[PDB]
Amino acid sequence: VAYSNNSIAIPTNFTISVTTEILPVSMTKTSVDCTMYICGDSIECSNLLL
């Protein structure tokens, strides 16, 4: 920057700029069946899971 005690710079023109800002609002909602994942629909399993 050129700096002086008696010097200033003043804009004689302007520019209009449009910019995009992206913010995540939500994430996928998920539900898990505990017996289906661990027992895999086994009758013998889930007796232990009680």
Next chain:
Amino acid sequence: GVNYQPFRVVVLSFELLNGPATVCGPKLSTTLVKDKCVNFNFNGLTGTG
């Protein structure tokens, strides 16, 4: 004495589910059921599907 008496030993080595099996236990086969939820016993593999 029994400790010194001769003993005949037979050792059986085998794999079960993996591979085609020409040796099977004495269970009668049943007609195949498809498109329904059923308990199945294919070559000693048991599952519900």
